[PDB]
């Protein structure tokens, strides 16, 4: 019983979305804003420094299509 019902919480990557968050096969959409590099270049003329892209929370990837299994998060508690 307890042998199968392994009631000892642990996190697992959603293998189905390969731990990302986008539906299987349907990979996360490369954030164009930061050219998939996770950082936007604040090209205010000379001072062309960068900022973390908020749109994709610096991950450079947009969960356009959320992996239902993990509600687009990308990882879940073993269950």
Cβ-count burial of 27 within 10 angstroms (0-12 exposed, 13-18 middle, 19+ buried)?
middle
Nearer to Zn ion among residue 6 and residue 68 (C-beta): 68
Of 35, 67, 71, 78, which lies in the binding site for Zn ion, with binding defined by CB under 5 A?
67
Q: Where do the DSSP E strands lie in 1-79?
A: 11-13, 29-30, 39-44, 47-52, 61-62, 75-77
Instruction: Work out whether 63 is an interface residue with Zn ion (CB under 5 A).
Output: no
> Does 69 help bind Zn ion (rule: CB under 5 A)?
yes
Q: Note whether 22 binds Zn ion by CB under 5 A.
A: no
Going by the annotation, the residues of the binding site are: 14, 17, 31, 34, 53, 56, 67, 70
């Amino acid at each position: 019983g307890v042998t199968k019902e392994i009631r000892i919480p642990t996190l697992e990557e959603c293998d189905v979305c390969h731990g990302s968050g986008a539906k299987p096969g349907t990979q996360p959409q490369t954030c164009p804003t930061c050219h998939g590099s996770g950082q936007v270049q604040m090209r205010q003329g000379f001072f062309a420094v960068q900022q973390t892209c908020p749109h994709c929370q610096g991950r450079g990837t947009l969960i356009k299509d959320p992996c239902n299994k993990c509600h687009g998060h990308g990882r879940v508690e073993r269950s």
